[PDB]
Amino acid sequence: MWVYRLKGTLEALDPILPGLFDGGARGLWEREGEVWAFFPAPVDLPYEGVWEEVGDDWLEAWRRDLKPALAPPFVVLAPWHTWEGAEIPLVIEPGMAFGTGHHETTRLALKALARHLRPGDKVLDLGTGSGVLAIAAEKLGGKALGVDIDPMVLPQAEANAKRNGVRPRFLEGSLEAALPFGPFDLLVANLYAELHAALAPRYREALVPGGRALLTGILKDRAPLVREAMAGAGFRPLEEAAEGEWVLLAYGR
Amino acid sequence: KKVVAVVKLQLPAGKATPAPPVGPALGQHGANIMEFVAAFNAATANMGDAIVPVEITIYADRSFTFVTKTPPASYLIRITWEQVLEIAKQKMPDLNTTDLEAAARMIAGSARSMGVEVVGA
Ligand SMILES: Nc1ncnc2c1ncn2[C@@H]1O[C@H](CSCC[C@H](N)C(=O)O)[C@@H](O)[C@H]1O
Numbered sequence: 001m002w003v004y005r006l007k008g009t010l011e012a013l014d015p016i017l018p019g020l021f022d023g024g025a026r027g028l029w030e031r032e033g034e035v036w037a038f039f040p041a042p043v044d045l046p047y048e049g050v051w052e053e054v055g056d057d058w059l060e061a062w063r064r065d066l067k068p069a070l071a072p073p074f075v076v077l078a079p080w081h082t083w084e085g086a087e088i089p090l091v092i093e094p095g096m097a098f099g100t101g102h103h104e105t106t107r108l109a110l111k112a113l114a115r116h117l118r119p120g121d122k123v124l125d126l127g128t129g130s131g132v133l134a135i136a137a138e139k140l141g142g143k144a145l146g147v148d149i150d151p152m153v154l155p156q157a158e159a160n161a162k163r164n165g166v167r168p169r170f171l172e173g174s175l176e177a178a179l180p181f182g183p184f185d186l187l188v189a190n191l192y193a194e195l196h197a198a199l200a201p202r203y204r205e206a207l208v209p210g211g212r213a214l215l216t217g218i219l220k221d222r223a224p225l226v227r228e229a230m231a232g233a234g235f236r237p238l239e240e241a242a243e244g245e246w247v248l249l250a251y252g253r
Numbered sequence: 254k255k256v257v258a259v260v261k262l263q264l265p266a267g268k269a270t271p272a273p274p275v276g277p278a279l280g281q282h283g284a285n286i287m288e289f290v291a292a293f294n295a296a297t298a299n300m301g302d303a304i305v306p307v308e309i310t311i312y313a314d315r316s317f318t319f320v321t322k323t324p325p326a327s328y329l330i331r332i333t334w335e336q337v338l339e340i341a342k343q344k345m346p347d348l349n350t351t352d353l354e355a356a357a358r359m360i361a362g363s364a365r366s367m368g369v370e371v372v373g374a
Contacts, residue, residue, distance in 0.1 A: 001272065001273050003273075010261060010306065014325075017263065017304070017325070018304065018325060018327050018328075021265070026265070026268070026270070026272070026273075027263065027264050027265070027269075027273065027274040027275065028262060028263030028264070028274065029261075029262055029263075029273070029277075029278050030261035030262070030263075036274065038272070038273045054273065057271060057276070058271050058272070058273075058276025058277060058280045058286060059271050059276075059286065059287065061276075061280055062279075062285065066283060093285065094283075094284070094285045094314075094315045094316060095285060095288050095316060096288060096292065096316060096317060097316055098312055098314055098316045099314070100314045101314070102314045102315050103313055103314035130316070
C-alpha cells in the first residue's frame, strides 16, 4: 500500500475528508497529529499532504503470536489452536467480549474454580463477558449462570458455550437478576475492587451457608477495600492468589 | 475491562478489509481484525456507499469494542427545498449544537453549495 500523511486530527481535517475518498482512499486512520489515508498507488493530491509507501498478512501476524493461555487445569484455545496436553480445553475465539483468557484475572479465576468448585455446585458467574468461567464451571460439573449488565456480550457467550459442548444459563442484569436463580454454592466475579466492595452484603445474600465467593478483577493496591467490605459482610477469608498486579481473594461464608 | 487503546478509524460502509488501516491499527494491539471486519461490515452492510467514523476500544485481553458515528452532511443528502428540516432532525443525534435551528442553516448553507436547492425558513 501507499499512505498520504496529513497534519491534523480527523475533526480538524473534516472539510477535506470526502475529497480524500473521491481521490481513491480506502480508509482513514487518526494517528498522533496526522491522518493517514491509505491508497493503492500515489495519485497527486491538492491537500498539502505527503506520501510514503509502506511495508507489505496482518492476518497471520496477530494470529501467529497468540498462543494457548495456560491456566491449570484448563487451557484457553482459539479455534485454530492445537493442544496435546491433558488440560481441559476451553475454546474461546478472541472476539468482542472480555474473557479471552489472555488476562491475569481471567486466569486466576479459572485456577480458583478448580480449587473450590465441588461437583454439582450451583455457580454464579457475575460479569460473564465471553462466558469463559461459566463454561469452565460446567466443564467441572457445576450448574452455571452467567449474568452481564451489557446485553452485547450475551450472544457471544452463548456461542462460546455452544462450541465447547456445555449449556449454562446466561441472562442480562446483575446480582439482582441472578437471585431468583439461586442461592448459589459458588460465586465467581471477575470485576473490580470498588464494585465488589459495594456488592459485599449482597454476595452474602446470594450464597448458601458454606458457599464461596472468588473475587478478582482487583488491582493489588485496591485490595484492602475488598478485604474490608467482605469482613463487614461476615465472610471469612481463604487463600489469596496474585499474578502481575492482580489478586484473587477467596472467601467462605 | 482495562483499556489499552482507542483507535479512531474512518471507513467505507461494508468495505472494511484486513489491509491497512484496519490490519495495523488493531493488529498492533493483537485484536482479532477479522472479527472486526465481519462485525463492522455487518453493522454497516446497510448504509450503502457512506463513510463511517468508527472508534475501536481495545482492551487488555485483546478483546475490543466499537461504536460507529453517523456520516457527513454531504452523503447524507442524496435537489431539495426544506426537507433539511427532515435531515436536521436526522442530523442531531448526528451533530453537536442542539440549536436544532443552528444546524438547519449550517447544513442547508452547506446543502446548497452542494448544491441541492433552497426553499427553507
Ligand atoms: N455491575 C455489573 N453486573 C454484572 N456485570 C457487570 C457489571 N459491571 C460490569 N459487568 C460486566 O463484567 C465484565 C467484567 S470482564 C470479566 C469477564 C469474564 N467473566 C472473565 O473472567 O474474563 C464485563 O463483561 C462487564 O460487562
